[PDB]
Homo-oligomer: A and B are copies of this chain.
Amino acid sequence: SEEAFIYEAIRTPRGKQKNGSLHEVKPLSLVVGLIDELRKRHPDLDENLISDVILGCVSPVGDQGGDIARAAVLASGMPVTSGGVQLNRFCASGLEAVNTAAQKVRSGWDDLVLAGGVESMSRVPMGSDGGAMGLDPATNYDVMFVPQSIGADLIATIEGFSREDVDAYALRSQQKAAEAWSGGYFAKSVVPVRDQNGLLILDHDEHMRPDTTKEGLAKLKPAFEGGFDDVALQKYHWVEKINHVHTGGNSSGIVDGAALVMIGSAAAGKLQGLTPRARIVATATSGADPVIMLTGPTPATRKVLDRAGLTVDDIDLFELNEAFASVVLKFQKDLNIPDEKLNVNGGAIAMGHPLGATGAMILGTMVDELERRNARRALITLCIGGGMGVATIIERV
């Protein structure tokens, strides 16, 4: 019935892990800053019309526990009726929050919804919450648990992606992220983080290494080198040995960050004088084998295209999370994606992958790039741990 429109999509800069700028900042303070920025953009916004606040958080413990969304509603002084709910679908929590927000708008039982994610990995490292598939031997032994990093090396081993092949893509992401910053693409969407006195804490993505050379990427050591290698090959028996191609320079960065997206119906936006920037065309979820794990995007992207009656040639921009270099190359190989349509402003390898917020970050990144290019459609998708996948198609308005 209804249609879901994106009116605002902002995010914090991504501060790195070691000696990072956002380490002193609580993850709640990151989300509050984005709420305070949305107020600046629309001071006469009736926050009573905001019926829910949905935040993704993969490690929802410590500073990120106790429904961090609800704490963002109370600490920011938003109306107590504005809801507040945390969810965790691993690496897609940020996008699943946006998709769930849109599906609540289309159902006619929600008017205007905030969505996004937060993940201070320097304060709450991944795995802090525990988990059954890791810390329970009965189910770990049965589901053949293997970390995401080894499934990425297996993808490169099967698909024949050399160490040079993945490092060649890592340089591409580093270059295209520096160009996007220098070109001013992120200026209106990256809200710098400040303290309680207004002093600047961070204004740029720290994890970027823009002076990266292909010779320096080859100096790095395969960092992801238990019995997970043997556990993986027990499932993929036709593979003899796993070529560990991924290093810290061609894998996603471990950073802190947060993202927010305002989603509502055309009536809700017209009621508050908001200009829609994009429209959620369709969503979809689907995955693949949990051992290789990171092959979930391909069926989910195919499904979201069949649902909206579109094909690859109808999409102007593709945006897949750069969790690992081989994942994107495998994705580009399957759907035959043009090289200039894929992660055009860099990705997680350069700027970082704050688990809970990455889905909403790359989502807003495509909204800002469709408008800058005056293009029509964009597809966002991410690989997920445990073998899942989510995909979303947006249309510029």
Specify which chain B residues have a CB less than 8 angstroms from the CB of A388 in the assembled complex.
70, 80, 83-84
**A109-121 interface mask toward B, CB cutoff 8 Å, 1 = contact, 0 = none?**
1100000000000
Specify which chain B residues have a CB less than 8 angstroms from the CB of A26 in the assembled complex.
132, 136
Q: Does A129 contact B (CB under 8 A)?
A: yes
Partner of A85, one of B89, B130, B290: B89
Number of A residues near B (Cβ < 8 Å) is 68
Specify which chain B residues have a CB less than 8 angstroms from the CB of A82 in the assembled complex.
287
A129 vs B307: C-alpha distance when bound (angstroms): 38
Q: A66-B130, A129-B61, A139-B28 are in contact. Are A85 and B83 (CB under 8 A)?
A: no
Contact A65 B129 (CB under 8 A): yes
Interfacial residues of chain A within 307-346, with CB under 8 A of chain B in the complex: 307
A66 vs B89: C-alpha distance when bound (angstroms): 9
Interfacial residues of chain A within 133-188, with CB under 8 A of chain B in the complex: 133-136, 139, 142-143
A106 vs B385: C-alpha distance when bound (angstroms): 27
Specify which chain B residues have a CB less than 8 angstroms from the CB of A104 in the assembled complex.
100, 103
Q: Does A189 contact B (CB under 8 A)?
A: no
Contact A28 B65 (CB under 8 A): no
Q: Does A362 contact B (CB under 8 A)?
A: no
Point out which of A62, A132, A286 has the most chain B C-beta atoms below 10 A from its C-beta: A132
Q: Does A387 contact B (CB under 8 A)?
A: yes
Q: A74-B386, A75-B142, A282-B109 are in contact. Are A89 and B61 (CB under 8 A)?
A: no
Contact A81 B287 (CB under 8 A): yes
**A57-71 interface mask toward B, CB cutoff 8 Å, 1 = contact, 0 = none?**
010111111111011
Contact B66 A131 (CB under 8 A): yes
In the complex, residue of chain B having the shortest beta-carbon distance to the beta carbon of A68: B132
A134 vs B26: C-alpha distance when bound (angstroms): 13
Q: A1-B1, A139-B28, A284-B109 are in contact. Are A133 and B74 (CB under 8 A)?
A: yes
Point out which of A65, A282, A286, A290 has the most chain B C-beta atoms below 10 A from its C-beta: A65
Contact B85 A96 (CB under 8 A): yes
Contact A88 B71 (CB under 8 A): no
In the complex, residue of chain B having the shortest beta-carbon distance to the beta carbon of A89: B85
In the complex, residue of chain B having the shortest beta-carbon distance to the beta carbon of A129: B65
| A46: min CB distance to chain B, Å | 15
Contact B132 A75 (CB under 8 A): yes
Q: A103-B109, A107-B102, A109-B284 are in contact. Are A90 and B63 (CB under 8 A)?
A: no
Specify which chain B residues have a CB less than 8 angstroms from the CB of A108 in the assembled complex.
106
Q: Does A288 contact B (CB under 8 A)?
A: yes
Contact A80 B282 (CB under 8 A): no
Specify which chain B residues have a CB less than 8 angstroms from the CB of A250 in the assembled complex.
none
Contact A85 B87 (CB under 8 A): yes
**A27-58 interface mask toward B, CB cutoff 8 Å, 1 = contact, 0 = none?**
01000000000000000000000011000001
Specify which chain B residues have a CB less than 8 angstroms from the CB of A90 in the assembled complex.
67, 70
The interface of chain A, by Cβ under 8 A from chain B, is 1, 26, 28, 51-52, 58, 60-68, 70-71, 73-75, 80-90, 96, 99-100, 102-104, 106-110, 129-136, 139, 142-143, 282-290, 299, 307, 385-388
User: What are 15 A-B pairs with beta-carbon distances under 8 A?
Assistant: A1-B1, A28-B139, A60-B60, A61-B61, A63-B136, A65-B129, A66-B130, A66-B133, A70-B90, A71-B131, A83-B285, A83-B287, A84-B89, A85-B88, A103-B110
A-B interface, 8 closest residue pairs, ranked by CB to CB distance from nearest: A66-B131, A65-B129, A65-B130, A103-B107, A71-B132, A106-B107, A85-B89, A87-B87
